[PDB]
Amino acid sequence: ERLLFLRSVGERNEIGFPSRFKSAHYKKPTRRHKSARQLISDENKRINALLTKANKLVPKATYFSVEAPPSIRPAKKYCDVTGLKGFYKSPTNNIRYHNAEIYQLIVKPMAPGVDQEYLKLRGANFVL
Amino acid sequence: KETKEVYEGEVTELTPEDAENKTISHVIVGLKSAKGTKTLRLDPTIYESIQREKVSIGDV
Amino acid sequence: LAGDVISIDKASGKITKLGRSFARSRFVQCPEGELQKRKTVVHTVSLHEIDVINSRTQGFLALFTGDTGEIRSEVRDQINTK
Amino acid sequence: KAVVIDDPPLRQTPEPFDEQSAYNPQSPIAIDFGSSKLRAGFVNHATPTHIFPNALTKFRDRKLNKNFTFVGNDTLLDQAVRSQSRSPFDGPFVTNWNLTEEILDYTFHHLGVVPDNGIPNPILLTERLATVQSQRTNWYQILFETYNVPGVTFGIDSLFSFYNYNPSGNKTGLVISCGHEDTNVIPVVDGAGILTDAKRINWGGHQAVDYLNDLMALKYPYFPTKMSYLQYETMYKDYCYVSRNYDEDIEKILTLENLDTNDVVVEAPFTYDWRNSILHLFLRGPRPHDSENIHEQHQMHLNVERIRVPEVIFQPTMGGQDQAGICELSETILLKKFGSQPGKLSQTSIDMVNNVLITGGNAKVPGLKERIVKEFTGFLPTGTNITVNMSSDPSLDAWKGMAALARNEEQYRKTVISKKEYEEYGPEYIKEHKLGNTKYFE
Numbered sequence: 001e002r003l004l005f006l007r008s009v010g011e012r013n014e015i016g017f018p019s020r021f022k023s024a025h026y027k028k029p030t031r032r033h034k035s036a037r038q039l040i041s042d043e044n045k046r047i048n049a050l051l052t053k054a055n056k057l058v059p060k061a062t063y064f065s066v067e068a069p070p071s072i073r074p075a076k077k078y079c080d081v082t083g084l085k086g087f088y089k090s091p092t093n094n095i096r097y098h099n100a101e102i103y104q105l106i107v108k109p110m111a112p113g114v115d116q117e118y119l120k121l122r123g124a125n126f127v128l
Numbered sequence: 129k130e131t132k133e134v135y136e137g138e139v140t141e142l143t144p145e146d147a148e149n150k151t152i153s154h155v156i157v158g159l160k161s162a163k164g165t166k167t168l169r170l171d172p173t174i175y176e177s178i179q180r181e182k183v184s185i186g187d188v
Numbered sequence: 189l190a191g192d193v194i195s196i197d198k199a200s201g202k203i204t205k206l207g208r209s210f211a212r213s214r215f216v217q218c219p220e221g222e223l224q225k226r227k228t229v230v231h232t233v234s235l236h237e238i239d240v241i242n243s244r245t246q247g248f249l250a251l252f253t254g255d256t257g258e259i260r261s262e263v264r265d266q267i268n269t270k
Numbered sequence: 271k272a273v274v275i276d277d278p279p280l281r282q283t284p285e286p287f288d289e290q291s292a293y294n295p296q297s298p299i300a301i302d303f304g305s306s307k308l309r310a311g312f313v314n315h316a317t318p319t320h321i322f323p324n325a326l327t328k329f330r331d332r333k334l335n336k337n338f339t340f341v342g343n344d345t346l347l348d349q350a351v352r353s354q355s356r357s358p359f360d361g362p363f364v365t366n367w368n369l370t371e372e373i374l375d376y377t378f379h380h381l382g383v384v385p386d387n388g389i390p391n392p393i394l395l396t397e398r399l400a401t402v403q404s405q406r407t408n409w410y411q412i413l414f415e416t417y418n419v420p421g422v423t424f425g426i427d428s429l430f431s432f433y434n435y436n437p438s439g440n441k442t443g444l445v446i447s448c449g450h451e452d453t454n455v456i457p458v459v460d461g462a463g464i465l466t467d468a469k470r471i472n473w474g475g476h477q478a479v480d481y482l483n484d485l486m487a488l489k490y491p492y493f494p495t496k497m498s499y500l501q502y503e504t505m506y507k508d509y510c511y512v513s514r515n516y517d518e519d520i521e522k523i524l525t526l527e528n529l530d531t532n533d534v535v536v537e538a539p540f541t542y543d544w545r546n547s548i549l550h551l552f553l554r555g556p557r558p559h560d561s562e563n564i565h566e567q568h569q570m571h572l573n574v575e576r577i578r579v580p581e582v583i584f585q586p587t588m589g590g591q592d593q594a595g596i597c598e599l600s601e602t603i604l605l606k607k608f609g610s611q612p613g614k615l616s617q618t619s620i621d622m623v624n625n626v627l628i629t630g631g632n633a634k635v636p637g638l639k640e641r642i643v644k645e646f647t648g649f650l651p652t653g654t655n656i657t658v659n660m661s662s663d664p665s666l667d668a669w670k671g672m673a674a675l676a677r678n679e680e681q682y683r684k685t686v687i688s689k690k691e692y693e694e695y696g697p698e699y700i701k702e703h704k705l706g707n708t709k710y711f712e
Contacts, residue, residue, distance in 0.1 A: 123590020164652030167613035
């Protein structure tokens with residue numbers, strides 16, 4: 001009864017393989033999912049190719065040029081597990097902690113392989 | 129009867145213009161607080177007092 | 189060096205060496221946790237010291253050398269109002 | 271003050287679909303290919319007729335050919351097809367183009383347009399900033415030779431939003447968009463979006479919900495049940511706001527007098543003093559922990575740091591992206607560019623300050639406006655008047671930008687590209703109209 005409702009909205013919806021909203025002279029060529037990172041990669045390759053055939057022409061507006069630059073003022077340090085002002089950082093696993101209770105209850109008994117998980121949120125998951 | 133006018137805030141900019149005639153003609157210093165910012169024009173003696181206090185960029 | 193116990197003042201940039209810790213190789217025990225701690229120090233200063241300080245011709249060294257030289261009345265009345 | 275539990279469930283829509291058979295074969299179609307929400311409608315109507323989450327499912331049913339119930343709120347009709355629903359729109363831009371053709375076929379069914387050749391109407395397209403050229407060639411293909419559209423123009427949706435709330439088209443202003451996936455700040459001079467000067471932040475709202483998921487998972491590693499990502503957006507939209515100033519709040523955010531009103535606890539669905547311990551206050555809030563109670567094992571004590579997930583827009587360094595925040599971008603734009611120097615604002619910069627528009631799907635968070643005006647008056651000289659504008663729905667205003675360019679006909683002819691120009695110039699051609707993208711080179 002619940003399944004037949006989904007089918008009911010389905011036959012309210014379906015379009016056959018020759019679609020009505022079609023150009024009447026088109027079909028589907030080859031189409032694979034190409035990675036967005038790969039799209040940025042070969043866009044970079046195309047601008048690099050164009051610039052290297054141009055100089056031997058500053059780009060006016062690309063995806064790379066409109067990316068925001070890094071900040072010039074020093075970034076504020078925060079505690080990695082509690083989010084407060086991280087005054088201290090552990091010398092073993094490089095985790096910024098708030099105070100003594102945090103350190104002795106979390107940072108010292110922390111299992112290996114999760115400090116990289118904490119540093120991934122800050123974008124310093126050094127381990128690769 | 130005297131008036132006391134004061135300037136408070138952070139040194140964002142410190143550009144000493146020389147205009148020799150080795151000796152700086154004037155220094156343009158911009159201050160900044162929570163309510164806004166304001167730029168000042170200062171003589172050589174205030175610049176020498178600034179170098180006395182070891183004021184750099186970012187000091188209140 | 190390694191093994192020393194020191195006190196670092198962040199605001200004034202003053203370091204004081206409290207002493208070497210318990211390393212066999214002066215000896216003072218290792219301090220307790222919770223660094224960057226709030227410490228309240230209560231200061232008691234006599235009015236004569238403020239009178240000597242506020243008189244600009246006398247440094248604080250007149251409190252020890254004992255050469256104050258007839259501190260005037262206007263610095264004293266300024267101190268009393270302050 | 272008794273503890274109240276909060277349920278995280280989202281119900282289903284029993285009425286997903288509706289359309290009208292009558293249509294105008296001359297009136298164009300206004301579309302918005304939104305990441306979080308696809309918006310559709312005609313020209314003559316003021317508000318968009320169809321709003322949809324831009325998602326599809328390929329529902330497989332035995333004995334009935336395994337292709338059912340594709341696009342719309344019918345995905346929200348059942349929780350199972352909601353869970354399997356695949357939004358094709360990736361990080362930059364969409365990956366699966368025939369999936370997009372399924373969306374366009376569905377909405378062309380839902381405007382009720384009877385098909386004449388491919389499409390008998392102009393199509394009003396939205397498009398992200400600084401698009402990859404292969405993406406726009408695929409757009410040219412999927413429009414022109416797949417759907418036979420007479421004319422398509424595409425531009426930055428926030429620029430159309432800027433035009434929508436200042437319809438003269440020649441005003442000077444600053445627009446800051448906070449979209450679903452990226453957010454960006456564009457300066458506009460004389461109604462022309464100068465795209466050499468704009469900057470883009472790779473955070474958006476997708477990564478905000480991802481950050482909230484990661485923090486809530488790391489805070490409670492031994493949580494019994496798993497909590498859904500739709501429930502994460504429910505929790506994000508419900509309990510989140512932006513601080514007036516982040517720097518003095520975080521010292522006070524675990525003070526005991528603060529936790530009475532700051533902390534709200536969420537209940538997951540199911541069927542050595544504590545005042546000295548700051549872990550107890552962080553993990554379990556202002557009521558003592560009941561370690562035996564099945565409610566407390568399923569209690570999600572957030573709002574201890576509800577400020578941290580919206581605040582990463584102003585500082586992307588907690589997000590891991592080494593990009594300057596919105597405040598620094600505003601410093602560089604308003605005090606170093608268009609002839610303005612620190613201490614002397616040019617007239618264009620003062621006009622940009624006088625008209626600041628913020629828009630997008632991520633502007634629904636409270637507290638953004640006062641933080642923006644206080645950060646702006648932090649660095650601007652005294653007496654510089656700052657006027658910042660908000661919508662009733664900041665996400666829905668790009669569709670009104672579509673309607674506004676559809677109204678203004680003498681401006682509409684400049685933006686519209688044709689089939690003849692596309693075939694003459696190839697897919698590597700973009701009109702450099704002011705309310706849209708510019709050429710990659712001079």
